[PDB]
Known about the structure:
The protein is α+β, with helices and mostly antiparallel strands. The chain has one domain (1-187): Nuclear Transport Factor 2, Chain: A (Roll), CATH 3.10.450. 58% of the residues lie in helices and 18% in strands. The chain contains 9 helices and 5 strands. Strands 1-2-3-4-5 form a 5-stranded antiparallel β-sheet. β4 and β5 form a beta hairpin. α7 (147-161) crosses α9.
Amino acid sequence: VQTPHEVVQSTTNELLGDLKANKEQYKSNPNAFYDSLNRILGPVVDADGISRSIMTVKYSRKATPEQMQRFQENFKRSLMQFYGNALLEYNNQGITVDPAKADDGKRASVGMKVTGNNGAVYPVQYTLENIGGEWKVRNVIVNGINIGKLFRDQFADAMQRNGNDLDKTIDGWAGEVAKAKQAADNS
């Protein structure tokens, strides 16, 4: 029943309220942090669609349920590892969820602005899909950087170097996200 705006806003509130409260616990315990992130973001994120897009359908169709699942576990845990600290260190304010424009009932867009302590406003564009009546986040753009595209390219590069070996690409995906981070930070 939640509109794209409500999904993004409510999830934002829910996440930050939890991080503010249990910051110290999550710092000393990555697993507890991981569980909360999955618990809060999981129901509103299309992990499968995100994974298929990163892998491209050509190779996603050549991935067993095991391989697909090992990849999601790796990816997520790597994201927390290389971006989670930035979340825990949030003691800022002024999160603006822009008024969401109309949708086609299948695809939706929601804008967000984050005001840092410096005062610099960073733009964030959420793309949501309607899966089985529910809106879930399919992709995100940060500072004009398409994240879905970023990791898609990184996966492609990895596959090229690994001779299109899925297992090798998935097993070393954490280091690929690490490269992705610095690749994005330099931009």
